[PDB]
Symmetry: C3
Subunit: 332 residues, 3 copies
C-alpha cells in the first residue's frame, strides 16, 4: 500500500556533484520525490565559441544524477515551461514498461506530468528524452542523465565484502554533431527548430564534431577539476546515452569496475580502461595512492585531446617513492 | 564411430523465427543434417526503394539460425545453383580447423559440397561467407547468419539453476554500405559484379548507409513485430558479423545476458544495454512484466532511428501499476 | 629497502616475439632493468609504398613487450638521441602516479632519463608516449607498446588451476591516419614536424586510413607468419592504444580470454571474438587442435581485409577428421 510509505523530497544538484544520500539504507522503502524542469538554452561548447541549442533536464548537460535504493519508488514531476518550444518526455532505463516511461510523459510547452516507477534492479542507468520521431536529436542535444539505484546494503566487492566510497562524482559524456557549411565552419541558428534537417544530416555521418564531459571542452578543469586526497575512495559514475566510450584514469586504475553498471554482478578488478557501451552508465571505484594532477579521459585519444573528452582530478597528500620515483631526472 | 550415430534432418525456417528444437537433449549425440541454398537476389532495404544485390544463405538476411547440442555433429549440404554468378563458401565460428570450414566449401555456381564438423563448444556463434579476396563484400551484402550450440542440459543461470525459455527469436543485424554518386544518391547496378570497386570504396569509409534488422528498415514492425505475453520468458539471439552493436529493449532489460554469447560463462545480470562485438553472436533472456509496445534497438540512437536498427515487440496481458504508473497525466 | 633487492638486466626483442621470462617466479621480487631508445624513422606501411614518419620505441611498431612479475620494480632507462627531432616521454598504464610516469620522463633530443615504478597489479597493460599537447599524434604515429605483469605463481583458469603457455606472441595493432590531398592521394613530408596540422585534420575524421599488425599491411604473413604445432598452448597478447578492436582466430577460438587483460579476474571461456577497448591490452590462450593456415584478424572485416588488420598462423601436425571433415568435396 503506497499511501502508507514515507515520502522524501530530494533537491538535485548540478553535475559533477551528486545529491546527499546514504549508501546503506537507514529506512525501509520510500517514495522518493524529484522535480525536474526542462530548459532549452544556448550553450557554448568549445574555446572557439561554437554555440548550440541545447535541450536540458534542469539546465545542465548532463542532467543531474538521481540516487535511490533498490525497491524504492521514484516519483518524478517533470515540468516543460511555456518558454520552451519543443515537446519532450523521459525514458528511464531503470524502469519497466511504457518505453521506460516515455509513452506516459509527453509534455508540450506549458505542461507538466508526474510519473512513478518502482526501482526493481540495482545499478546505474541512463535516462534520456525520447520523443517519437526525434529521439537521437534530443539525446545528442544534451537531453540525458543517469539514475543510481543502490542495493539496500550498499556496494560489495567480488568477495561480497562492503565497499564504501568517500566521494562520488558523475561524469556525463556527450557526443555533439554540430552542422557544418561547405568549407567546414559550424552553422548557427536562432531557434532549435531551425537546425532540424541540418542536424539530421550531421548525425548521419556518425562522426561527432565534439565529445565533451559536463557539457563543454575543458568543463572539468582548472577551478572545476575534480578533487580528492590520498587515501580517499572515490566512485566515478560515467554515462554515455548514445555512443561507446572507454574511460581511463591517467596515472591510476579502476580498482573495481562495473563497466555496464549493474551491481548484482561482481566488479572487474584492476582495470586500465573499460568500455561503457552507448546507452549505458558504468561506475568505477578507485582509492588514490599518489598526489598530483590526474587526467580522466575517453581513451580514444583523438576523442579525448582533440574532440574534448578529458577532465582533471587534483589530488592532495603525500608522495610515495616506493610506487614511483624518478631515478635520474631528464638530462643530456 | 560416426556411422552408428542417429541422423536427423532439420528443415530450417526464416528469421526471426527458429526451427523446432529441444533445450534439454532428449537423445544422445546425433549427426544433425541441414541443407542451405545460396541465393543472390535484389533486395529493397529502405522506405525510399533503395535496392542492393544481396548475397544470401537460404534467401534471407540474415541466414537462418541452426540449433544443435554440444557434441552433436553438424552436417551441412551447401548448394550454389547455376543461376548465381559468384563463388561462395561458409565459415562457421563454431567449428575448429580449415578457416571454420571456409577452406573446404568453395562452391562455384552449379556446385555443391557437404561439410561435417563437431560442435565442441556451447554458445551462439556467427557463420558467414568468406571467399579469398572478397570477404567483407560478401558479409556486408548479407551473407551471414548464426548457429546455437546448446549445452546438453540446457541453459543455466549464474548460480547453475536451469533457465528455460518459452519463445526464442533471432535478430540478425546488418551493416550495408550502398555506394553513392557525387551528390549523395545511391547507385544501382544490373549485376553483383558491376558494383565491386564502388562497393570497396563505400566500405573503406567505415560508415554504413543502412543498419537493419532482418534485412530491411522496418522489417520487425507492424504485422511483423515480435510477440510475447506478460510472464513469458524470451531468449533473443542477436548477431553482427562485421560491426559492434549495443542492443537495448526499450521498457525492459536483459535479465540474463551472454553478451559475447558463450554459455560456459555465467550471464551478466540486469543489463540495460550490452555490447556485442562485430564478428560475434550474443543472447539475452528476459521475462516480460508489462504489456504494450517495446522497441528493441541498437542504442547508438542514430544507428537505430536514422539508419534502421530498430524493431518492435508487441506484448499482451495485464498492466501492473506497482511497477509503473502515471500519477498526474500530462496537463497544463 | 630497494638497494638490497637483486637487479636483473633484460635485453628486449622485436615484436611479435617476446623476451625470455619465467611464468612462475623462480626468485623473490627484483628490480628489472630495461633500456629503450626512441627512434623517429620513415616506415613503409602498405603494398602501394605509402610512407609515414613513425615515432617508435626501440625501432619497432609496436614497441617491445616487457615482462615482469607482480611486485617487481621496473626500472627503465629511456634514451632520446639527438638525431630525433621531437620531445617524447612514456606513460605506463601499469604504473601509479605522475600520469603513469609521463610527468617525469619528458626527454628532449639528446637527453635520457631513468624511471622506476612498482608493478602492483597483474595483467597486460599499454604503455605509450604522451607529450603535453601532442598526445594522439605520437600514439597514432606508432609510439606505443605493452607490458605484462605476471602473477608470481603464473596464470590460472576460472577454477584457479594453473594455465601454462608453450609459446607467447605479441600483436600490436596500429591505427594510422595518413593525410590525403583533394583527390584522396596520401601526402608525403620530409620531416615529422611538417605533417603536424595535416595530421590533426586527418585524426579528427576518426577514420583510419590503415589498421595494421606489427607496423605494416602483411607484416605477420609469409615468412613472418606466427607458428605453432598441434597440441601447443599459445598466449597471444594484443594491444590497441587508441581504438577498439575485436580479435578473432579464423578456424579457432579464444579458449581462455582476458579481453581487458587483468589477471585477477577469471577468464572468459570459449570466445569466438572479444572486444579489446582502445587504450587496453588483452590476452587470449588457445590450444591448437588442427594443422594448417589460420588467419588472426580484427573482425570488423573491412578493417581486416581492406585496411590491413590481418595476420597468419601456420600450424604443423596431424589432421583430426572427427573435428572436421569434407564429406563431399565441391563438385557439379
Ligand atoms: O509548465 N507547467 O507547469
Ligand atoms: O555507438 N558508437 O560507439
Ligand atoms: O566509437 N565510440 O567512441
Ligand atoms: O595514459 N593515457 O593516455
Ligand atoms: O553490469 N555490471 O557490470
Ligand atoms: O548446384 N548443385 O546442385
Ligand atoms: O566494428 N565496428 O564497430
Ligand atoms: O560502431 N559500432 O556501432
Ligand atoms: O530508451 N531507449 O532509447
Ligand atoms: O561469452 N559469453 O558471455
Ligand atoms: O641521448 N642521451 O643519451
Ligand atoms: O575508439 N574507437 O574504437
Ligand atoms: O571502432 N573500432 O574498430
Ligand atoms: O571467420 N572469419 O571471418
Ligand atoms: O580484465 N581482465 O579480463
Ligand atoms: Cu527532449
Ligand atoms: Cu534508451
Ligand atoms: Cu558469398
Ligand atoms: Cu569470421
Ligand atoms: Cu613521442
Ligand atoms: Cu593512456
Amino acid at each position: 500500500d503506497i499511501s502508507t510509505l514515507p515520502r522524501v523530497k530530494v533537491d538535485l544538484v548540478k553535475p559533477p556533484f551528486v545529491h546527499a544520500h546514504d549508501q546503506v539504507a537507514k529506512t525501509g522503502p520510500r517514495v522518493v520525490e524529484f522535480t525536474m524542469t526542462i530548459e532549452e538554452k544556448k550553450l557554448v561548447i568549445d574555446r572557439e565559441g561554437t554555440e548550440i541549442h541545447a535541450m536540458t533536464f534542469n539546465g545542465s548537460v548532463p542532467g543531474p544524477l538521481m540516487v535511490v535504493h533498490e525497491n524504492d519508488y521514484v516519483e518524478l514531476r517533470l515540468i516543460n515551461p511555456d518558454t520552451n518550444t519543443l515537446l519532450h518526455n523521459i525514458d528511464f532505463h531503470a524502469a519497466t514498461g511504457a518505453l521506460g516511461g516515455g509513452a506516459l510523459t509527453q509534455v508540450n510547452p506549458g505542461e507538466e506530468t508526474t510519473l512513478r516507477f518502482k526501482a526493481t534492479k540495482p545499478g546505474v542507468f541512463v535516462y534520456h528524452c525520447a520523443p517519437e520521431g526525434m529521439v537521437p536529436w534530443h539525446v545528442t542535444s544534451g537531453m540525458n542523465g543517469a539514475i543510481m539505484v543502490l542495493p539496500r546494503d550498499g556496494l560489495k566487492d567480488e568477495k561480497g565484502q562492503p565497499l564504501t566510497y568517500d566521494k562520488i562524482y558523475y561524469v556525463g559524456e556527450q557526443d555533439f554533431y554540430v552542422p557544418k557549411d561547405e568549407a567546414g565552419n559550424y552553422k548557427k541558428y536562432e531557434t532549435p527548430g531551425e537546425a532540424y534537417e541540418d542536424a539530421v544530416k550531421a548525425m548521419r555521418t556518425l562522426t561527432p564534431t565534439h565529445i565533451v564531459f559536463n557539457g563543454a571542452v575543458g568543463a572539468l578543469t582548472g577551478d572545476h577539476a575534480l578533487t580528492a586526497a590520498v587515501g580517499e575512495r572515490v566512485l566515478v559514475v560515467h554515462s554515455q546515452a548514445n555512443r561507446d566510450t572507454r574511460p581511463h584514469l591517467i596515472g591510476g586504475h579502476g580498482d573495481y569496475v562495473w563497466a555496464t553498471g549493474k551491481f548484482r554482478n561482481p566488479p572487474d578488478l584492476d582495470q586500465e580502461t573499460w568500455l561503457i557501451p552507448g546507452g549505458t552508465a558504468g561506475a568505477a571505484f578507485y582509492t588514490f595512492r599518489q598526489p598530483g594532477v590526474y587526467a580522466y579521459v575517453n581513451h580514444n585519444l583523438i576523442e579525448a585531446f582533440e574532440l574534448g573528452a578529458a577532465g582533471h582530478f587534483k589530488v592532495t597528500g603525500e608522495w610515495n617513492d616506493d610506487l614511483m620515483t624518478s631515478v635520474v631526472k631528464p638530462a643530456s
